[PDB]
Design a protein around this ligand. Structure first.
Ligand SMILES: Nc1ncnc2c1ncn2[C@@H]1O[C@H](COP(=O)(O)OP(=O)(O)O)[C@@H](O)[C@H]1O
Ligand SMILES: Nc1ncnc2c1ncn2[C@@H]1O[C@H](COP(=O)(O)OP(=O)(O)O)[C@@H](O)[C@H]1O
Ligand SMILES: Nc1ncnc2c1ncn2[C@@H]1O[C@H](COP(=O)(O)OP(=O)(O)O)[C@@H](O)[C@H]1O
Ligand SMILES: [Ca+2]
Ligand SMILES: [Ca+2]
Ligand SMILES: [Ca+2]
Ligand SMILES: [Ca+2]
Ligand SMILES: [Ca+2]
Ligand SMILES: [Ca+2]
Ligand SMILES: [K+]
Ligand SMILES: [K+]
Ligand SMILES: [K+]
Ligand SMILES: [K+]
Ligand SMILES: [Mg+2]
Ligand SMILES: [Mg+2]
Ligand SMILES: [Mg+2]
Lengths: 524, 524, 524
């Protein structure tokens, strides 16, 4: 198909207009004072949201060149949200700031390559300052605080997350589900999560998360082999009755067992799943007995001399719910006895003094973390057909952001951290003047999040920004209460990874656009 | 698809314009002097109505931004009606008043967040003031009055509902169906209601009430779960041959069974509905047997050796009528014999004294209460197929509204309550002047219903509003007689829950619109 | 879909214009001097009619609001005609008169609800005056006069109906049907009429009259529900042979049997019609046997052990002609032997003295009437085929009006009755000036029919109307001869029911329109 082709300022004005439409719609939702955006649906009542992620998702423009501008910033803000677990709106706001001032610099006749070079220096320096400024979120109050803020200032979800981490630990397994109720609840059960992918993708019963979930299934294991389904027939029958879906994990299902198994999944008479299996050769024998011990099942191998034919209905392990993702598979609430599981822990704990290398004490300790750790499950319990599918996606991210806080720490929220970092970078310089202007472009942008938050309050960004800059450390503006004070004490905490990611992705796309001389698309 | 995006004033103006079209069309039907609105049908003759609910449902605008505004206020008003039983027109009048003045204030440049806080504060206080002003509906007279008003001053309706509730008791089952002749019929038959909904919303043949209406349906009671349609084949074919619909009650309906029971229900089934049997264990079995004895059906259990394919036409129960809501299933006039039914009730009572648990006594009680209770049936009299369906519409409405009156009590109608509450709030204040303006916005709006009623009479809203304000307590304007008096003595009563719910929902959407900076929709 | 929404004056002029197109097309055909209206057909020569009912049927307008106006008045005039058996044109004329003057009053700023109140009051008064003015229609001479006027001064039609009533009585059953050449026949035969409709409208072999007609059909009488066609199969094979169409009278026909027969009559090569037996309980089984005695057939019941599959050719009764409308079924000339029938009658007569309730005595009385009453068959002869059908249609029309004349009596035609009642209401007043204007609106409108009749003559409506007003009693204008005189002596008679209904229905829709503030319809 013949193409529409634009060059230079022509290309860039259209990108900028498209960026402007995207960012102007998204930025109004930033901070506790965010305005509402009405989003139309094909039929029925419109959706009304303060959520920048939902707003960005709907933006697409008629003009193709403008549209490319918007999709560029979207993709990049979307990557920040997936890496850090939050920051989409912040990343979008920053991107518009850098792009706008950057293109003014290009239009004045300044070297774009130098402009981009100075922006990058500023960002690399800004990222180090953030790492310096950061402080640990080690503590229940703080974790709850950060959770609450990633939760859109919802205490309950912040309380839940900090509650989960208390029981299962900071790096412990935590999963998000629906459940039945108008309110959200938390449960801590026996289960584990190891990295195994689906053997075939078509197992997936839920395309949204691209994962498989079976309800009250059975678990199978190897060992051997599995070359042929002929020995998979007898155990498939008994599982057919009782209406309980079957799960087969290990090990290395191949041939028609790998193939003819995936056929019956597409047809509605069967529900089955398979996984990439344990970390073997030798260690799989350890991992499997761990799974079997958790699921209350038995491990039947040909090595020992046992056959898959003799395997009975009770020979299988069991769990309440199972989830198999692309790279991962999780077991929720195994039915294995606690006396069994507990003794299996001690058996592995002896091997710690029995370990002749640092490499073994890692693995075996990773196993005791799976069995002894358990799995904390939170049920969103937002009651609606539409409200459920959504709130599960935000809490899933709110959990990701808290994890990010626990890893790389936290900094003063409300755009204060970026304001502070920019003040420290006041002396930073480039190789030439154009690189210098680039640097100042980045440093000006770092004020945009605070300014926008304030503007959404109906107060004057100039005055508040000035007042905050005139202060020190974690002093900031609390946009909920309209008062200044210590941001950390006030509990307004950004995960450092989130602030960091927002700026980096923002600056990425902005460098790209500032360095863009040509666009190609389809004819109108 | 590419989107049309508007911001700020340009957006709010279009939204307000769509609200005006909706409200101006709905509000002229308010009260006993309501004007007619003519609504077209693609075929046949136009519908002429004073019912705000019917007018609202038809409104959709060509301009997509205007339409979003209309749909926003519609949803909120129907949420109110769904919660309180009545008040759609009132809610819309209130929404228009709050939005209009609120938007005027925003255009003047006041802080929209503060405006919303002000409105919210006035409503919260108004709601309490309303609860205090409220009075219980104790007896048949006041109950009749409430029904009569919700019936558009039809005293025969109020009389019916008062008598229906007298027979079944104020806590108990009352349904309504088309009558065979000019006269009204009130009879109490054998029936029952438990809590289960439809498994899929597509089962709804009546979009207005969102309910599944099935006339002379066969009832399948299954003690198992159905994931597969192939075993439902011989049973269904028998049903499609008899020219009757089918209600499926089992453990669950899923897999291809559901999906097939959905699409096939659209054309060639030609009608079927299925609900999840309430409870579990021996309770779920015992409840199914209750339903079987009522409809003269036989429960299918796998443990007795019975199968679905061996199920004949006489293993299916039968009832005159069955209705299914999202949370509810109602079986009216089972064919089951007395002796089987009476033999059953004497059996559960015998289970009371044998029962060793106080919990079991209350649980077995709920079962005898349903079998011995039966269901009250109201058949709407005459006079023609279109007139009937309108009267059946009113009786249902009045039924809902009378409920609400029972729970939360009543207040003076004619918009007098909101007028009184407003005058009590004269001294209310906010944190700043903008919140004050918001409070005055809400208080001004609380005069909208009375004024509109008066305006529909062809009188002058200012003069009447003034006179009522100068009066005291339940003193008001009777718009039917155009005479002032005591609203309670004149039998003009609104359920407090209705007035409350209307103000709240209206204020909810208004606050949303006052705080909206951006709208996204499809291209024209 | 998006809607077009109009308000107030903008909405009302469009309704008015639509009413004007409908009314101006219909009203030119009023009375003996009515002008021709030409109605197109997709092929061949146009239809030329002086019949208002035919003109009104064809009117539909492009502008969707104008169309709404017209359909509203059509529905109402149509309702009048169905109730009283004539008056469509009169009602349409009255409706236009009230609407036109009423809207003039609205535009002047008068209270629309008061205007309606005033119109309503004058109408109920006029209805009482019509009842007072009404005179009995008893003698064959007055009856034939009534029939003649309904027939457009066809004195042959009036004579036929009068003759028919001289035999079966004034409440007797009368059917008209295609006769032999040129010569009318009237003969009373064994037969009856009960209320049952066609179960499938597709059964109709006469799309115009809207009724199914079976010639010398067999008649099946079954006391059970026919579901499976297989039970019905052998009884059909006997009907397939002998080439005698079948009439199935059963408790009901549904499912496989319904859809099976309904389609087979469409494809041709088969003739069948199904109707449900009237009443329920024991009264249903009695009336079935009634039809069985009349047709000389046998009732097939489940109780005595009679099987529908064992029903032989002699089990079925026979009629000469059978005519099934949507409302009623008529069996003409049953084959049942006189001794049979009259024995069944004396059996009922006995039970009439045995009745312990006056409900039975009325019901049993109804039956003997149908059995011993017989049916009058009017056979219309004509010079040509096309000349026969229209004369037949003239008789069917006049039959309706004649019955109405018999029930409620007669008044002076030519719109003199309405003129007289109006002059008598001159002092009538309402609660205020606006109500007074409404009354005058109605009173002025009552002159519209005479004026229009005179206008179709080509004379001056003011002069004739003024002269009639100047006289008393039944003095009026004869439009046929263009002379004044006594309307009753000249045989110009309106059934009081017709005049009353036309006025009532016209005032109904007129008040509705005078009170409409909003119209909602589809976009063009
Ligand atoms: N009480 C508060 N005062 C000031 N800033 C706040 C407050 N609560 C949250 N914020 C800020 O709002 C920002 C998050 O806004 P949000 O609308 O979630 O955009 P994003 O999608 O980028 O997270 C963070 O920078 C956070 O510090
Ligand atoms: N005789 C009356 N005098 C004054 N107000 C009345 C009278 N009858 C009903 N109303 C008022 O009409 C309102 C309900 O009117 P309606 O048109 O049904 O609107 P909605 O759909 O909001 O209930 C109530 O506020 C009630 O008090
Ligand atoms: N010879 C006559 N002189 C005056 N009026 C007549 C005469 N014959 C019939 N009419 C009147 O014509 C009217 C019937 O009009 P028609 O054309 O049948 O329309 P509609 O459907 O209203 O009956 C009646 O009011 C009747 O009295
Ligand atoms: Ca749309
Ligand atoms: Ca610059
Ligand atoms: Ca139409
Ligand atoms: Ca104001
Ligand atoms: Ca603003
Ligand atoms: Ca002349
Ligand atoms: K937000
Ligand atoms: K109303
Ligand atoms: K302020
Ligand atoms: K005519
Ligand atoms: Mg966030
Ligand atoms: Mg109401
Ligand atoms: Mg006529």
């Amino acid at each position: 198909a013949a193409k529409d082709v634009k060059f230079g300022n022509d290309a860039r004005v259209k990108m900028l207009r498209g960026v402007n439409v995207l960012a102007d719609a998204v930025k109004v939702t930033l901070g506790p004072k965010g305005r509402n955006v009405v989003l139309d649906k094909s039929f029925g009542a419109p959706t009304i949201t303060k959520d920048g992620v939902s707003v960005a998702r709907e933006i697409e423009l008629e003009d193709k060149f403008e549209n490319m501008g918007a999709q560029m910033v979207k993709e990049v803000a979307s990557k920040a949200n997936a890496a850090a677990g939050d920051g989409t709106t912040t990343a979008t706001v920053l991107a518009q700031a850098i792009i706008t001032e950057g293109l003014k610099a290009v239009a004045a006749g300044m070297n774009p390559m130098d402009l981009k070079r100075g922006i990058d220096k500023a960002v690399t320096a800004a990222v180090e300052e953030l790492k310096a400024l950061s402080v640990p979120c080690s503590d229940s109050k703080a974790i709850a605080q950060v959770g609450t803020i990633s939760a859109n200032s919802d205490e309950t979800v912040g309380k839940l997350i900090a509650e989960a981490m208390d029981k299962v630990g900071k790096e412990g397994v935590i999963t998000v589900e629906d459940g039945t109720g108008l309110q959200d609840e938390l449960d801590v059960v026996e289960g584990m999560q190891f990295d195994a992918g689906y053997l075939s993708p078509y197992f997936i019963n839920k395309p949204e998360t691209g994962a498989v979930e079976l309800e009250s299934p059975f678990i199978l294991l190897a060992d051997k082999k599995i070359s042929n389904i002929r020995e998979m027939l007898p155990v498939l029958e008994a599982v057919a009755k009782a209406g309980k879906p079957l799960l087969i994990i290990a090990e290395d299902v191949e041939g028609e067992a790998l193939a003819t198994l995936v056929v019956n999944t597409m047809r509605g008479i069967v529900k089955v799943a398979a996984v990439k299996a344990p970390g073997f050769g030798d260690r799989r024998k350890a991992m499997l007995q761990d799974i079997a011990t958790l699921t209350g099942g038995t491990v039947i191998s040909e090595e020992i001399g046992m056959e898959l034919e003799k395997a009975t209905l009770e020979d299988l392990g069991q769990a309440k719910r199972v989830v198999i993702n692309k790279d991962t598979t999780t077991i929720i609430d195994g039915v294995g006895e606690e006396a069994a599981i507990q003794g299996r822990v001690a058996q592995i704990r002896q091997q710690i003094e029995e370990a002749t290398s640092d490499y073994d004490r890692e693995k075996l300790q990773e196993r005791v973390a799976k069995l002894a750790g358990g799995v904390a499950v939170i049920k969103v319990g937002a009651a609606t057909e539409v409200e459920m599918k959504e709130k599960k996606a935000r809490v899933e991210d709110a959990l990701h952001a808290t994890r990010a806080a626990v890893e790389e720490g936290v900094v003063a929220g409300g755009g204060v951290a970026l304001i502070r970092v920019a003040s420290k970078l006041a002396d930073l310089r480039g190789q030439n003047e154009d690189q210098n202007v680039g640097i100042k472009v980045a440093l000006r942008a770092m004020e945009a999040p605070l300014r926008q938050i304030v503007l959404n309050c109906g107060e004057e960004p100039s005055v508040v920004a000035n007042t905050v800059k005139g202060g020190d450390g974690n002093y900031g503006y609390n946009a909920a209460t309209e008062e200044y004070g210590n941001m950390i004490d006030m509990g307004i905490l950004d995960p450092t990874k989130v602030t960091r990611s927002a700026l980096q992705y923002a600056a990425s796309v902005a460098g790209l656009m500032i360095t863009t001389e040509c666009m190609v698309t389809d004819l109108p």
